[PDB]
Design a protein around this ligand. Sequence first.
Ligand code: CL
Ligand code: CL
Ligand code: CL
Ligand code: CL
Ligand code: CL
Ligand code: CL
Ligand code: NA
Length: 129
Amino acid sequence: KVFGRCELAAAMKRHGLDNYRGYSLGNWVCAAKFESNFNTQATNRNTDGSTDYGILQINSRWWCNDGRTPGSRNLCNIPCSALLSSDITASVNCAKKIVSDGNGMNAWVAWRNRCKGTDVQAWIRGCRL
Ligand SMILES: [Cl-]
Ligand SMILES: [Cl-]
Ligand SMILES: [Cl-]
Ligand SMILES: [Cl-]
Ligand SMILES: [Cl-]
Ligand SMILES: [Cl-]
Ligand code: NA
């Protein structure tokens, strides 16, 4: 599913991401924009052979099992395929674990480089929520 900007912002808000671990909603929408362009089916293979899945490009090295990342962990206890669903639940719940792990949203290198320090509220402007 490719989400619209306000649609995703509403869906993330319904799933408990507004102010989660103190990150306003615009952080989460900005991160998804540059990670996936709001496409739940986005995948990309990393240099080391692991693969990132879904609207927030969650990595099989640490977070999910795709059966093809030898020696990796599955800290969200999900198949990576779960993260491609039109329903964002699995992605959201796994993102909550990730952002709770010590490094906050810096885990998303695109968030650090493109969203952090910026006017992230712009990302939810004009949306009804
Ligand atoms: Cl947009
Ligand atoms: Cl695994
Ligand atoms: Cl959803
Ligand atoms: Cl933090
Ligand atoms: Cl990253
Ligand atoms: Cl509300
Ligand atoms: Na894994």
